[PDB]
CSV table of C-alpha atoms in Angstrom, one decimal:
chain,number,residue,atom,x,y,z
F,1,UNK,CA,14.3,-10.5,3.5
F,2,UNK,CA,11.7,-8.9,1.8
F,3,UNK,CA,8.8,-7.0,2.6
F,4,UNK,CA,5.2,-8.6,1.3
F,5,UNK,CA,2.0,-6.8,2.0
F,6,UNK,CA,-2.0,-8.0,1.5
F,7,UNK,CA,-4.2,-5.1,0.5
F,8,UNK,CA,-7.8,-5.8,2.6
F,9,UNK,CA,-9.5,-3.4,0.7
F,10,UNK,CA,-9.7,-1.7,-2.6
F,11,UNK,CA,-7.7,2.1,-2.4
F,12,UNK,CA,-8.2,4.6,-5.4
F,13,UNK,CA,-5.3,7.2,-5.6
F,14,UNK,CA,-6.8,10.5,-4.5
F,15,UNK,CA,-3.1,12.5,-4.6
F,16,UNK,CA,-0.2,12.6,-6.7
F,17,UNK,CA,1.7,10.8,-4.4
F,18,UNK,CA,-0.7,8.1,-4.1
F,19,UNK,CA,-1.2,4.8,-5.5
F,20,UNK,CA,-4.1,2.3,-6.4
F,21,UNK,CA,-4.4,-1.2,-5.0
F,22,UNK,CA,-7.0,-4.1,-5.4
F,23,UNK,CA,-8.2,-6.1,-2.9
F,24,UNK,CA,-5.9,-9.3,-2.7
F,25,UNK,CA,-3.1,-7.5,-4.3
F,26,UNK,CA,0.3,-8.4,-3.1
F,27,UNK,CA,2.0,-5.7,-2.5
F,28,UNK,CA,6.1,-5.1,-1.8
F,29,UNK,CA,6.2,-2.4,1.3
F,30,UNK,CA,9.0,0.3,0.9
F,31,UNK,CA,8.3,2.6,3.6
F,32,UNK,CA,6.3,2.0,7.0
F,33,UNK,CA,7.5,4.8,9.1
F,34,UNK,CA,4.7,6.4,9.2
F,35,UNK,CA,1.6,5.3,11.2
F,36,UNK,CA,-1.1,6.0,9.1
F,37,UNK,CA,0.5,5.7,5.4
F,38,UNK,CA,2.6,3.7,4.0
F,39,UNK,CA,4.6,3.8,1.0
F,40,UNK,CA,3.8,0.6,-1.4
F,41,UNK,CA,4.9,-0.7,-4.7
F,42,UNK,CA,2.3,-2.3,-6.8
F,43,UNK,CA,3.8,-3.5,-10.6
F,44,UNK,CA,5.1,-0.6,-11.5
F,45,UNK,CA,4.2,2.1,-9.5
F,46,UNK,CA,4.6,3.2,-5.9
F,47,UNK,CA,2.8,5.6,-3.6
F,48,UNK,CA,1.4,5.9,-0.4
F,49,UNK,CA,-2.0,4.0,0.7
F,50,UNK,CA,-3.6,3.9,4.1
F,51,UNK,CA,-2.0,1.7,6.5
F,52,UNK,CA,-4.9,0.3,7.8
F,53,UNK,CA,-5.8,-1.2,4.6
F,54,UNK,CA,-2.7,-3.7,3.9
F,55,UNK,CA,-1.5,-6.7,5.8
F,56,UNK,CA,2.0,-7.7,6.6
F,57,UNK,CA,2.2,-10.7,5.6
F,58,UNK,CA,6.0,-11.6,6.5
């Protein structure tokens, strides 16, 4: 039951409540309400990153 994303591009935090992924990452999705950003954890931080660049993957 849990939530598995694949970033498909690089993503530099440019906010506070932003976060950075690498390209490849696997990331666990916590909030997808939102059409354009959604709220990802990668290790040990979370933030938002565009939804365009991840993958569900499950």
């Amino acid at each position: 039951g849990k939530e598995l994303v694949l970033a498909l591009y690089d993503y530099q935090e440019k906010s506070p409540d932003e976060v950075t992924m690498k390209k490849g990452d696997i990331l666990t999705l916590l909030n997808s309400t939102n059409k354009d950003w959604w709220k990802v954890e990668v290790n040990d931080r979370q933030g938002f990153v565009p939804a365009a660049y991840v993958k569900k993957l499950d």
